[PDB]
């Protein structure tokens, strides 16, 4: 059992407890206090890894499962702050959309690439790259 | 006004007569013979031109307004032979998907590019380019 697997399991678990609500005032704060202390550390770990990418982080944070209610999870803003950092990096590189497509591992999905939760991010980068 | 415009207008009008079912046997044969005689010539002209691209041909052949039933027009298969030739050209050159994107002029459509009748062709070339 790995540290990252357990921690992520705990962040998915904590997110459900916050989405259900009806928590004691001190209990909800103690959960939100523990979540806030995991933001910087997970965001920095994901940015330094060569194997971590958005579709994987989406899955490990519980957002894939949530489907259309993914934005209701406390972990959405964390995933958001991660993709924001990636787009900032790729823009500083002036990466081409074809390079971004491989960063997002969309090449491995074949014909299912358009169904990826990363796909709207890829399309926006591609359009912005080419908007004269 | 111009010869090219008039010929394309006859291709659209001849296509409508076939689809509309009012022709005798002999008039049907004669319209289909005339249409066949235009096939190689239009194909060569569009492939030789640097300013002709699929979305444009699709419109000048009357397909855009047909939507999904565009395949019912006799001109659909002329359009398809044109995009087959393009796809085989770009595949032989090993042109990158980013290059294919601006060959299709999808860059001019910005956030509306995904609604382009050429978009599935782009997505297919892109997926096929990065397979393994």
UniProtKB/Swiss-Prot annotation, chains A, B:
Keywords: Host cell membrane, Host membrane, Membrane, Secreted, Signal, Virulence
Localization per Swiss-Prot or TrEMBL: Secreted; Host cell membrane
Gene it is expressed from: Avh240
Superkingdom per UniProt: Eukaryota
GO cellular component: extracellular region; host cell plasma membrane; membrane
Family: Belongs to the RxLR effector family.
Source organism per UniProt: Phytophthora sojae
Oligomer and partners: Homodimer. Interacts with host soybean aspartic protease AP1.
Keyword Membrane (UniProt): yes
Main localization category: secreted
Role according to the record: Effector that suppresses plant defense responses during the early stages of pathogen infection. Suppresses cell death induced by effectors and PAMPs in plant hosts. Avh240 dimerizes and localizes at the plasma membrane to interfere with aspartic protease AP1 secretion, which presents an effective mechanism by which effector proteins suppress plant apoplastic immunity.
Record remark on domains: The RxLR-dEER motif acts to carry the protein into the host cell cytoplasm through binding to cell surface phosphatidylinositol-3-phosphate. The alpha 1 and alpha 2 helices (residues 58-108) are required for the localization the plasma membrane.
Factors inducing expression: Expression is strongly up-regulated during the early stages of infection.
Span list, region Host plasma membrane-binding: 1-50
Protein name (Swiss-Prot/TrEMBL): RxLR effector protein Avh240
Membrane is among the record's keywords: yes
